[PDB]
């Protein structure tokens, strides 16, 4: 009976995910052995910080990572649904039904579900990229994570997406929106209402110079220099030493005249910003103050990649060769105080449209500060799902999808004769865990909300054409209500690309566990 105990080991981790999806979800504090606390609400990121022992759970963890890499959303739907398929299959194994026909039954039920997803599409996203149109897709992503911030964070995320996207329609050949185009930064102090949207990267460090900001001139030239600032010498060794005091006057004045000569040629070309990836000497900062050149140091090589796609600058392996062809252009750069400290940000005006934006977060809570940082990353991948593979189609969410599939699957159960009826019926019952989870965690009675969900999708209408309301989902209440309410009032929908991809992954996840009747391992 090892296959039964394997489900019980997953059942211990199943209840952990039942308290994740929904508005009742909470982040988990994990103390690493290196003395670092990583806090995230996302389940896929949580599995990376957790050490999995039993390899049977690793199959579900590897299936969860598939949801985060491609579609980036729906990781809670994959893990919870795959865990319920093992519970409904436990009764079939104990009943005497072999696991061979159980696996074959899921393959027939999966093909029947994918064909019905096209007829369940309610609305169609026009991909207008409007600020008001993006509020419908982003709202359910922020929902079931952090409560109360769905109204404020909806306008901040939707505004940054429209800045990095150009103007185009009905063209899917050339991709535009990437996953790195949206960066999230954090700073101590402020609130959510005072947060703004920046059209470019935000630098929270100090300029390290007496020049606070550049002028208002159009098309500022920005040059990225990987070579550090110093007098040109031999690449091999070349350490400056003083044998006697006579050579001190020649070596000291030589470094001052050589650096000043290189900065004069760069300032004449119209470059007001010099980006030095390496360290900057003491005498180099003295000449940059009189020429009015902004001092910027970016030691991280990851930040220079997204900078090349905005202004068009290119890193130069040498120093003192301001090639105008590889220089970048930015409309306006300003240094303002955001969050209590004066920092130099990066933005634009009209031309040189930036392909990367950054949203600044402000708040007095440290725990909820990193919560929004990890929550926006789940919303970034939602924009990627708007492409050709079923980006415009959408399905109603809030538990309305899993309940509606029950009536369609059971209708095809009696149509297919043979032993396949056992796996088809249990496949639809496994969808009942989603509506029960939201009602149990929210404190709603099972004897009340649950029977009203079945009566919402099942009614007696004297006619062939459907009518009344098929959009009624699972309601969290929170104030008062009688029965359930329409989901179309809050406009909470789920994309087809997210739901269709989550079904195929969850189906193959439970297939691997049921197919393994023996596990052989050894100590390390």
């Amino acid at each position: 009976g090892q296959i039964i105990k394997s489900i019980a080991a997953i059942r211990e981790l199943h209840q952990m995910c039942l308290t994740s999806m929904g508005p009742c979800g909470r982040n988990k504090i994990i103390v690493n052995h290196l003395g670092k606390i990583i806090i995230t609400n996302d389940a896929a990121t949580m599995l990376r910080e957790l050490d999995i022992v039993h390899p049977a759970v690793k199959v579900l963890v590897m299936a969860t990572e598939q949801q985060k890499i491609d579609m980036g959303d729906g990781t809670n739907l994959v893990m919870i649904l795959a865990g319920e398929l093992l519970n409904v299959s436990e009764k079939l194994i104990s009943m005497g039904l072999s696991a061979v026909e159980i696996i074959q039954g899921y393959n027939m039920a999966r093909k029947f579900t994918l064909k019905e997803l096209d007829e369940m599409v309610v609305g169609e996203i026009t991909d207008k990229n409007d600020k008001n149109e993006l509020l419908k897709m982003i709202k359910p992503v922020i929902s079931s994570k952090k409560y109360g911030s769905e109204d404020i964070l909806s306008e901040l995320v939707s505004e940054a997406v429209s800045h990095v996207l150009p103007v185009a329609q009905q063209a899917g050949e050339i991709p535009y929106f990437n996953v790195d185009s949206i960066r999230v930064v954090k700073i101590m102090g402020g609130s959510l209402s005072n947060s703004t949207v920046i059209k470019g990267m935000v630098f929270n460090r100090e300029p390290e110079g007496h020049v606070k900001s550049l002028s208002e001139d159009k098309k500022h030239k920005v040059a990225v220099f990987t070579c550090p600032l110093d007098i040109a010498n031999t690449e091999t060794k070349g350490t400056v030493l003083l044998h006697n005091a006579q050579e001190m006057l020649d070596f000291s004045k030589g470094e001052e005249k050589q650096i000043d000569a290189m900065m004069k040629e760069i300032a004449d070309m119209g470059v007001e910003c010099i980006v030095a990836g390496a360290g900057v000497g003491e005498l180099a900062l003295h000449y940059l103050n009189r020429y009015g050149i902004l001092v910027l140091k970016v030691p991280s090589k990851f930040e220079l990649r997204r900078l090349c796609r905005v202004c068009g600058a290119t890193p130069l392996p040498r120093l003192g060769a301001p090639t105008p062809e590889e220089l970048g252009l930015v409309e306006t750069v300003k240094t303002m105080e955001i969050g209590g400290d004066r920092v130099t940000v990066f933005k634009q005006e009209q031309g040189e449209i930036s392909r990367t934006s950054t949203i600044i977060l402000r708040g007095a809570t440290q725990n909820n500060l990193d919560d929004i940082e990890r929550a926006i990353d789940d919303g970034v991948a939602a924009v990627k799902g708007l492409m050709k593979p079923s980006g415009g189609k959408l399905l109603p969410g809030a538990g309305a999808t899993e309940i509606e599939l029950i009536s369609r699957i059971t209708k095809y159960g009696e149509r297919t004769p043979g032993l396949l009826q056992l796996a088809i019926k249990q496949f639809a019952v496994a969808f009942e865990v989603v509506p029960r989870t939201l009602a149990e965690t929210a404190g709603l009675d099972v004897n009340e909300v649950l029977p009203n969900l079945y009566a919402a999708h099942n009614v007696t209408e004297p006619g062939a054409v459907k009518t009344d309301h098929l959009y009624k989902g699972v309601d969290i209440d929170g104030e008062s209500d009688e029965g359930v309410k329409d989901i179309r009032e809050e406009n909470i929908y789920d994309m087809l690309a997210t739901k269709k991809f989550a079904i195929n992954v969850a189906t193959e996840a439970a297939t691997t566990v049921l197919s393994i009747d023996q596990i052989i391992m050894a100590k390390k």
């Binding site: 009696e414 032993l419 009826q421 099972v446 004897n447």
Partner: protein, 462 residues
């Protein structure tokens, strides 16, 4: 001592389930024998569930309540004792995840079982087919199911005629809308009680209406034929019957009065005399005292049908009549069920499957909290025919799904055969069972299953 919380509900389910799971092999003509280990060197080799359950020592009180149910069910009908216990135990098994894991209130389950009990009886009545209760040749075949494959198979021709007149004697057909439905007022225990007399013949054995006594006339010369004899229990009566003995002094006093003195009469037989007479005896049919079988008899009968009597059994010896006793009583239980209603039900598990199919389709239209436990009842109704499949050697997975699909197309009378092991029709191949057993199996199992869930704590004390 005491069990609180959710652990007490699990102990109540597993108490009656552990007893029902063991007797699963006692159902059907293919039922497998069982072997119990007694402290004495003997053992119980029979497969009868009523004999095995009485010898099993139980601890939890829920199993004790299941034993009392088997004693009551065995008195009503001859067979089907293990069917009630298994059906009542499987309902608690299917309701185990709903009561514990799903956290469903027990009264909701109890209230749903009471609603499903009415729907289960209406489906059986529709599946049942009409039968003629007045046909003497048809009643012999209905009883023959309990005759053959027994020691009485040699007398089966005579047993079907003897069991027919034995049932026809106690039953009386009366009905009207004035005083209501009397339901024939049939009682096997007191009214159909039989007395075994050694000697005679089985074919010549007849059923006499009245009380039979072995005491003869106390006077040597007396009239052995009376026109209108009057029975008096203790006006110038024609007969004098005394419960206790009578001295010889009272013989000459009542001799001139034209009455016979009869002493040594049992007290239990005086209650049945009031039915043929009314004494707290005019219109008495036959007074003939003529000796039959070297034993003096007496005829208390008349021209009326009091529905009370003592059946006189005769045979080749006392050992032969001893086996006829338990065989005739079990045979009349099937014939009594035919008179309770002119309907018959398909055997072999077809009636069990007919309820589960109609329950799942009707429960979907109610749309309420009771809809979930109805699916657990339909699964429990399918375990009775599936249990016979496990004993028939066939695939329990394949034969269960193929049989359920045939109900949506064909009729509900198609059961499972024990001899063959494949899905076949019960009506065409001559497999029938009475409906009264089906009504008593579903009603008593649901009523007993609800009482086991009403106790949430075990109180210890005197």
């Amino acid at each position: 001592e005491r069990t609180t919380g959710r652990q007490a509900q699990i102990s109540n389910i597993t108490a009656a389930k552990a007893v029902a799971d063991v007797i699963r092999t006692c159902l059907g003509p293919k039922a497998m024998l069982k072997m119990l280990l007694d402290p004495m060197g003997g053992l119980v080799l029979t497969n009868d569930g009523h004999a095995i359950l009485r010898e099993i020592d139980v601890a939890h009180p829920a199993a004790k309540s299941m034993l009392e149910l088997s004693r009551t069910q065995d008195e009503e009908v001859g067979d089907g004792t293990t069917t009630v216990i298994i059906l009542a135990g499987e309902i608690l098994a299917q309701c185990a995840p709903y009561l514990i894991e799903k956290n469903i209130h027990p009264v909701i389950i109890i209230q749903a079982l009471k609603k499903a009990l009415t729907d289960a009886l209406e489906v059986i009545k529709q599946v049942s087919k009409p039968v003629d209760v007045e046909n003497d040749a048809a009643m012999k075949k209905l009883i023959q199911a309990s005759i053959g494959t027994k020691y009485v198979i040699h007398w089966s021709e005579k047993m079907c005629e003897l069991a027919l007149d034995a049932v026809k004697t106690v039953r009386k057909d009366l009905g009207q809308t004035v005083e209501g439905e009397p339901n024939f007022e049939i009682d096997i225990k007191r009214y159909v009680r039989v007395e075994k007399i050694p000697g005679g013949d089985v074919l010549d054995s007849r059923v006499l209406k009245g009380v039979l006594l072995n005491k003869d006339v106390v006077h040597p010369k007396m009239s052995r034929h009376i026109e209108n004899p009057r029975v008096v229990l203790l006006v110038r009566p024609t007969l004098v019957i005394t419960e206790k003995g009578v001295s010889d002094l009272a013989q000459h006093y009542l001799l001139k009065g034209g009455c016979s003195v009869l002493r040594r009469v049992k007290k239990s037989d005086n209650n049945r005399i009031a039915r043929v007479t009314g004494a707290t005896g005019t219109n008495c049919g036959l007074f003939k005292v003529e000796m039959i079988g070297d034993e003096y008899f007496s005829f208390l009968d008349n021209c009326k049908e009091p529905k009370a009597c003592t059946i006189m059994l005769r045979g080749g010896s006392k050992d032969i009549l001893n086996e006829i006793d338990r065989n005739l009583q079990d045979a009349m239980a099937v014939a009594r069920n035919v008179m309770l209603s002119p309907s018959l039900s398909p055997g072999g598990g077809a009636t069990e499957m007919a309820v589960s199919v109609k329950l799942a389709e009707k429960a979907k239209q109610l749309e309420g909290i009771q809809q979930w436990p109805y699916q657990a009842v339909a699964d429990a109704m399918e375990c009775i025919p599936r249990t016979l499949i496990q004993n028939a050697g066939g695939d329990p997975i394949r034969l269960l799904s193929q049989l359920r699909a045939k109900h949506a197309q064909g009729n509900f009378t198609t059961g499972i055969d024990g001899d063959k092991g494949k899905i076949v029709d019960m009506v065409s191949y001559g497999i029938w069972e009475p409906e009264v057993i089906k009504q008593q199996s579903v009603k008593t199992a649901i009523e007993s299953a609800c009482l086991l869930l009403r106790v949430d704590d075990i109180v210890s004390g005197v």
